Amino acid sequence: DQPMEEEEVETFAFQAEIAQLMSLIINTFYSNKEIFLRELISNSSDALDKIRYESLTDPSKLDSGKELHINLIPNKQDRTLTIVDTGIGMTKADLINNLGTIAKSGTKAFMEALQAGADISMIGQFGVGFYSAYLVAEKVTVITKHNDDEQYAWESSAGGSFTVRTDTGEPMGRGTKVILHLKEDQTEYLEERRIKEIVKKHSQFIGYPITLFVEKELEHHH
Numbered sequence: 347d348q349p350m351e352e353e354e355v356e357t358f359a360f361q362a363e364i365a366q367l368m369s370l371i372i373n374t375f376y377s378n379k380e381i382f383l384r385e386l387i388s389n390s391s392d393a394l395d396k397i398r399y400e401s402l403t404d405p406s407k408l409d410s411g412k413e414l415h416i417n418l419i420p421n422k423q424d425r426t427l428t429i430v431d432t433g434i435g436m437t438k439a440d441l442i443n444n445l446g447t448i449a450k451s452g453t454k455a456f457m458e459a460l461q462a463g464a465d466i467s468m469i470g471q472f473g474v475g476f477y478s479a480y481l482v483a484e485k486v487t488v489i490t491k492h493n494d495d496e497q498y499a500w501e502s503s504a505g506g507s508f509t510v511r512t513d514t515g516e517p518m519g520r521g522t523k524v525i526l527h528l529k530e531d532q533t534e535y536l537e538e539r540r541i542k543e544i545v546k547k548h549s550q551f552i553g554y555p556i557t558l559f560v561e562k563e564l565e566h567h568h
C-alpha cells in the first residue's frame with residue numbers, strides 16, 4: 347500500500363532575536379494592528395520592483411508571466427487572508443535565509459527602538475515588517491516560486507521554529523503568496539469594507555494593480 351504523496355519536511359530554528367521579536371508581536375496588545383497589510387503589500391511591491399528591474403535587461407525573465415500585480419484574497423470559511431504577488435519570488439535558500447535563520451541588524455534595532463518608545467508601525471523601517479503578520483495571524487504560510495526553481499512552502503506558528511517543504515498544490519507562474527491564518531478575534535480583516543479602507547488609507551502610493559478576490563467554496567464543494 348503506497349502513499350498518494352510523500353515529501354520531505356525540514357524544520358529550522360529561528361535565530362534568537364527573530365524568535366524574540368515574534369514572541370513580542372504575537373503576544374502583545376497593540377491598537378493599530380491593521381498595519382500588517384501595508385507591510386505585506388510593501389514587500390510585494392518591492393518583489394515586483396525586483397523582477398521588473400531584471401526584465402529591463404532580460405525580457406525572458408517574464409516568460410513565467412508578464413503581469414505585475416498584487417491580489418488580496420479573503421476566505422471566511424478557512425479564516426485566511428492571502429496576499430499574492432507575481433514578484434521575483436524566492437529560492438529554497440532564500441526562504442531559509444530570509445525568513446528566520448539569519449539575523450538582520452534591524453531585528454534587535456527594532457526591539458531596542460520599541461523599548462526606547464518607538465511605535466510598532468515603524469517596523470518596516472527596520473526591514474522586518476513581514477513579522478507584523480503575527481499581529482493578526484496565529485500561523486503564516488508562505489508559498490513562493492522563483493524563476494528556474496521549484497515551488498516551496500514555508501510555515502510557522504511561531505514558538506521558535508518554522509518548516510520548509512516543496513509545494514505540490516496549484517502551481518504558480520512566479521511570485522509569492524502569504525497566507526494568514528487569522529486569530530479568532532481578528533476576522534474583521536476578512537470583510538470587504540475593512541480591507542478596502544485599509545488599502546485606501548495605507549497603500550495609496552503602490553504602483554501596481556491591487557485586486558480583491560473574495561473567495562467562497564460553494565456548498566458541498568469545499
Ligand SMILES: CC(F)(F)CNC(=O)N1Cc2nc(N)nc(-c3c(Cl)cc(Cl)cc3OCCn3cccn3)c2C1
Pocket residue numbers: 389390392393396431433434435436437440444445474476477488522524
Ligand atoms: C533575491 C530576492 F529577490 F530578494 C529574493 N526574494 C526575496 O527574498 N523575497 C521576495 C518576497 N516577496 C514577498 N511578497 N515577500 C517577501 C518577504 C517575506 Cl515572505 C518574508 C520576509 Cl521576513 C521578508 C520579505 O520581503 C522583504 C523585502 N523584499 C521584497 C523582495 C525582496 N526583499 C519576499 C522576499
